[PDB]
Design an enzyme around this catalytic site. Structure first.
Site, short mmCIF file in Angstrom:
data_model
loop_
_atom_site.label_atom_id
_atom_site.label_comp_id
_atom_site.label_asym_id
_atom_site.label_seq_id
_atom_site.Cartn_x
_atom_site.Cartn_y
_atom_site.Cartn_z
CD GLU A 35 -2.97 -0.90 0.13
OE1 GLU A 35 -3.85 -1.68 -0.06
OE2 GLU A 35 -3.12 0.20 -0.49
CG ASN A 46 -8.80 6.11 -4.46
OD1 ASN A 46 -7.80 5.48 -4.61
ND2 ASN A 46 -9.27 6.39 -3.04
CG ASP A 48 -13.75 7.31 -5.78
OD1 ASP A 48 -12.83 7.88 -5.26
OD2 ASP A 48 -14.45 6.60 -4.93
CB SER A 50 -12.14 8.94 -2.34
OG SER A 50 -11.54 7.72 -3.11
CG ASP A 52 -6.68 4.97 -1.30
OD1 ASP A 52 -7.76 5.42 -1.04
OD2 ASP A 52 -6.30 4.27 -2.14
CG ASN A 59 -11.72 4.83 1.16
OD1 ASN A 59 -12.63 5.44 1.49
ND2 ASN A 59 -11.84 3.35 1.42
CG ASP A 101 -17.36 -2.19 6.70
OD1 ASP A 101 -18.07 -1.57 7.73
OD2 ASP A 101 -17.56 -2.38 5.72
#
Ligand SMILES: [Cl-]
Ligand SMILES: [Cl-]
Ligand SMILES: [Cl-]
Ligand SMILES: [Cl-]
Ligand SMILES: [Cl-]
Ligand SMILES: [Cl-]
Ligand code: NA
Length: 129
Positions: A35, A46, A48, A50, A52, A59, A101
Protein backbone atom coordinates in the site's frame (compact mmCIF):
# COMPACT_ATOMS: atom_id res chain seq x y z
CA UNK A 1 8.09 8.61 8.42
CA UNK A 2 9.40 5.65 6.47
CA UNK A 3 9.35 2.63 8.79
CA UNK A 4 11.75 -0.23 8.64
CA UNK A 5 10.07 -3.59 8.09
CA UNK A 6 10.68 -4.97 11.58
CA UNK A 7 10.11 -1.52 13.14
CA UNK A 8 6.63 -1.40 11.66
CA UNK A 9 5.94 -4.99 12.70
CA UNK A 10 6.85 -4.06 16.26
CA UNK A 11 4.66 -0.94 16.22
CA UNK A 12 1.72 -2.83 14.74
CA UNK A 13 2.08 -5.56 17.35
CA UNK A 14 2.21 -3.03 20.20
CA UNK A 15 -1.00 -1.46 18.85
CA UNK A 16 -2.78 -4.82 18.88
CA UNK A 17 -2.93 -5.78 15.20
CA UNK A 18 -1.26 -9.21 15.51
CA UNK A 19 -4.12 -11.66 14.92
CA UNK A 20 -6.71 -8.87 15.06
CA UNK A 21 -9.88 -10.34 13.51
CA UNK A 22 -7.70 -13.40 12.90
CA UNK A 23 -5.12 -11.70 10.72
CA UNK A 24 -1.55 -12.52 11.70
CA UNK A 25 1.02 -9.74 11.90
CA UNK A 26 2.62 -10.69 8.58
CA UNK A 27 -0.64 -9.90 6.78
CA UNK A 28 -0.59 -6.35 8.12
CA UNK A 29 3.06 -5.81 7.31
CA UNK A 30 2.58 -7.20 3.79
CA UNK A 31 -0.43 -4.94 3.26
CA UNK A 32 1.52 -1.89 4.40
CA UNK A 33 4.43 -2.80 2.14
CA UNK A 34 2.36 -2.81 -1.03
CA UNK A 35 0.00 0.00 0.00
CA UNK A 36 2.62 2.54 1.08
CA UNK A 37 6.11 0.99 1.06
CA UNK A 38 6.00 1.63 4.82
CA UNK A 39 5.71 5.42 4.31
CA UNK A 40 3.24 7.14 6.63
CA UNK A 41 3.09 10.19 4.30
CA UNK A 42 1.87 8.21 1.28
CA UNK A 43 -1.18 9.62 -0.50
CA UNK A 44 -2.84 8.50 -3.71
CA UNK A 45 -5.82 9.88 -5.59
CA UNK A 46 -8.54 7.44 -6.64
CA UNK A 47 -10.50 7.57 -9.91
CA UNK A 48 -13.70 8.43 -8.02
CA UNK A 49 -12.08 11.55 -6.54
CA UNK A 50 -11.43 10.13 -3.09
CA UNK A 51 -7.88 9.86 -1.74
CA UNK A 52 -6.01 7.09 0.12
CA UNK A 53 -3.84 8.10 3.09
CA UNK A 54 -1.00 6.67 5.15
CA UNK A 55 0.70 3.34 5.73
CA UNK A 56 -2.47 1.39 4.99
CA UNK A 57 -3.88 3.78 2.36
CA UNK A 58 -7.20 4.38 4.08
CA UNK A 59 -9.73 6.12 1.86
CA UNK A 60 -11.64 9.37 2.28
CA UNK A 61 -14.84 8.01 0.72
CA UNK A 62 -15.76 6.19 3.93
CA UNK A 63 -13.22 6.45 6.68
CA UNK A 64 -11.70 9.91 7.12
CA UNK A 65 -12.43 13.53 6.29
CA UNK A 66 -10.28 15.44 3.83
CA UNK A 67 -12.86 18.12 2.96
CA UNK A 68 -12.78 17.34 -0.75
CA UNK A 69 -14.56 14.02 -1.22
CA UNK A 70 -18.22 14.70 -2.11
CA UNK A 71 -20.92 12.54 -0.58
CA UNK A 72 -18.35 10.74 1.52
CA UNK A 73 -18.36 9.70 5.16
CA UNK A 74 -15.87 9.89 8.04
CA UNK A 75 -16.58 6.68 9.94
CA UNK A 76 -13.26 6.75 11.82
CA UNK A 77 -14.01 10.32 12.93
CA UNK A 78 -10.58 11.68 12.00
CA UNK A 79 -9.06 14.14 9.57
CA UNK A 80 -7.28 12.19 6.84
CA UNK A 81 -4.08 14.09 7.71
CA UNK A 82 -3.98 12.19 11.03
CA UNK A 83 -3.32 9.10 8.90
CA UNK A 84 -0.01 10.60 7.72
CA UNK A 85 1.49 11.00 11.20
CA UNK A 86 4.73 9.35 12.28
CA UNK A 87 2.54 7.97 15.08
CA UNK A 88 0.52 5.13 13.53
CA UNK A 89 -2.18 5.09 16.24
CA UNK A 90 -4.89 6.68 14.07
CA UNK A 91 -4.09 4.39 11.12
CA UNK A 92 -4.22 1.31 13.32
CA UNK A 93 -7.45 2.30 15.06
CA UNK A 94 -9.11 3.02 11.74
CA UNK A 95 -7.75 -0.20 10.21
CA UNK A 96 -9.36 -2.12 13.08
CA UNK A 97 -12.75 -0.63 12.15
CA UNK A 98 -12.25 -1.34 8.45
CA UNK A 99 -11.24 -4.97 8.89
CA UNK A 100 -14.30 -5.47 11.11
CA UNK A 101 -16.63 -4.09 8.39
CA UNK A 102 -17.51 -7.46 6.86
CA UNK A 103 -15.02 -8.42 4.16
CA UNK A 104 -12.00 -8.58 6.44
CA UNK A 105 -8.73 -7.62 4.82
CA UNK A 106 -10.20 -7.95 1.33
CA UNK A 107 -11.06 -4.26 1.93
CA UNK A 108 -7.45 -3.68 0.90
CA UNK A 109 -7.34 -4.67 -2.77
CA UNK A 110 -3.53 -4.89 -2.65
CA UNK A 111 -3.77 -7.32 0.27
CA UNK A 112 -6.15 -9.52 -1.73
CA UNK A 113 -4.02 -9.35 -4.86
CA UNK A 114 -0.53 -9.56 -3.39
CA UNK A 115 -0.65 -10.91 0.18
CA UNK A 116 -3.69 -13.16 0.49
CA UNK A 117 -2.71 -16.82 0.41
CA UNK A 118 1.03 -16.12 0.30
CA UNK A 119 3.68 -16.88 2.93
CA UNK A 120 3.04 -13.65 4.82
CA UNK A 121 5.09 -14.85 7.83
CA UNK A 122 8.14 -13.99 5.72
CA UNK A 123 7.35 -10.32 6.34
CA UNK A 124 8.11 -10.65 10.06
CA UNK A 125 10.97 -13.13 9.73
CA UNK A 126 14.09 -12.15 11.68
CA UNK A 127 12.19 -9.50 13.62
CA UNK A 128 12.61 -9.15 17.34
CA UNK A 129 8.97 -9.13 18.41
CL1 LIG B 1 10.93 -4.49 2.83
CL1 LIG C 1 2.47 -13.80 10.11
CL1 LIG D 1 -15.35 15.67 2.07
CL1 LIG E 1 -11.75 16.73 10.05
CL1 LIG F 1 3.86 4.44 16.19
CL1 LIG G 1 -12.16 -12.45 7.91
NA1 NA H 1 -14.72 11.46 3.76
Amino acid sequence: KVFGRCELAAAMKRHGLDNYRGYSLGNWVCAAKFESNFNTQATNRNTDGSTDYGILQINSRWWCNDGRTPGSRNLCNIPCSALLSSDITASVNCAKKIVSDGNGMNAWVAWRNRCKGTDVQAWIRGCRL
